[PDB]
Design an enzyme around this catalytic site. Structure first.
Site, PDB file in Angstrom:
ATOM      1  N   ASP A  59      42.004  43.050  44.097  1.00 14.87           N
ATOM      2  CA  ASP A  59      41.594  42.720  42.734  1.00 14.87           C
ATOM      3  C   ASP A  59      42.361  41.516  42.196  1.00 14.87           C
ATOM      4  O   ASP A  59      42.734  41.465  41.022  1.00 14.87           O
ATOM      5  CB  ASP A  59      41.774  43.931  41.818  1.00 14.87           C
ATOM      6  CG  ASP A  59      40.861  45.086  42.193  1.00 14.87           C
ATOM      7  OD1 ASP A  59      39.766  44.829  42.734  1.00 14.87           O
ATOM      8  OD2 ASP A  59      41.245  46.251  41.951  1.00 14.87           O
ATOM      9  N   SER A  86      47.187  42.422  31.965  1.00 12.23           N
ATOM     10  CA  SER A  86      46.590  42.337  33.292  1.00 12.23           C
ATOM     11  C   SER A  86      47.084  41.072  33.973  1.00 12.23           C
ATOM     12  O   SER A  86      46.780  39.962  33.526  1.00 12.23           O
ATOM     13  CB  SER A  86      45.066  42.332  33.206  1.00 12.23           C
ATOM     14  OG  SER A  86      44.495  42.158  34.486  1.00 12.23           O
ATOM     15  N   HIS A 108      39.402  40.999  37.966  1.00 14.34           N
ATOM     16  CA  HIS A 108      38.601  41.569  36.891  1.00 14.34           C
ATOM     17  C   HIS A 108      38.827  40.877  35.550  1.00 14.34           C
ATOM     18  O   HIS A 108      38.101  41.175  34.595  1.00 14.34           O
ATOM     19  CB  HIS A 108      38.884  43.069  36.758  1.00 14.34           C
ATOM     20  CG  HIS A 108      40.283  43.399  36.338  1.00 14.34           C
ATOM     21  ND1 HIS A 108      41.251  43.808  37.229  1.00 14.34           N
ATOM     22  CD2 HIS A 108      40.864  43.423  35.115  1.00 14.34           C
ATOM     23  CE1 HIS A 108      42.371  44.062  36.575  1.00 14.34           C
ATOM     24  NE2 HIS A 108      42.161  43.838  35.291  1.00 14.34           N
TER      25      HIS A 108
END
Lengths: 49, 151
Positions: B50, B102, B28
């Site tokens: 992901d 992230s 993402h």
């Protein structure tokens, strides 16, 4: 002609065999892919749990 | 270094890291890795986790992070300090984590990777983290709390 024709009147047992093998073969191959798809998802679920 | 921030418009919106010879970036997180050698490798997708991954270049394979699946109860660390691992979830004090963190890995007391943080959930006292970790059998699993948000 005394008799009457139909769609399946001219289809021999050999032709039906090839039709059954063709339709059965392709269907079984797709089903194999779908079963594999279902099992891998179930295996991955057990990895989490 | 071992951690390589991912930049989109000149700002960091995530981090890439190299673990065991593979370069892991969140799926993402869109942008270019802040590197020159590792930015040229084509990455494979792992959207079920992901993540995206690829092979480390020969000159970088030795200078990479090692990881472990052994997660005994106690304290683990990452870039922003201590991380608590209890009740099978990694959590940080409220406000310690947030968007932009992230792909940041979590390290044990020996500096080994135990999880890659992808998001989190803000609980009553600590923020629960959405991480990619390795279960009791060492298989990659996505460990997420309920209602996690991508960071």
């Amino acid at each position: 002609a005394q008799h009457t024709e139909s769609f399946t009147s001219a289809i021999s047992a050999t032709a039906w065999s090839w039709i059954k093998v063709l339709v059965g073969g392709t269907s079984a191959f797709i089903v194999l892919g779908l079963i594999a798809t279902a099992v891998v998802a179930l295996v991955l679920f057990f990895h989490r749990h | 270094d071992k951690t390589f921030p991912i930049m989109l418009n000149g700002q960091v919106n995530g981090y890439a890291c190299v673990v065991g010879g593979r370069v892991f970036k969140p799926l993402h997180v869109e942008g270019r890795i802040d590197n020159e050698q590792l930015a040229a490798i084509k990455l494979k997708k792992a959207s079920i986790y992901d993540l995206e991954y690829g092979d480390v270049p020969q000159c970088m394979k030795s200078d990479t992070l090692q990881y472990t699946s052994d997660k005994p109860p106690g304290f683990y660390n990452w870039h922003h300090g201590a991380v608590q691992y209890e009740n099978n979830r990694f959590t940080v004090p409220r406000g310690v984590g947030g968007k932009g963190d992230s792909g940041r890995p979590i390290l044990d007391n020996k500096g080994r990777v135990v999880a890659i943080v992808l998001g989190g959930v803000n609980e009553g006292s600590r923020t629960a983290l959405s991480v990619v970790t390795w279960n009791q059998k060492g298989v990659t699993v996505k460990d997420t709390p309920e209602g996690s948000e991508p960071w």
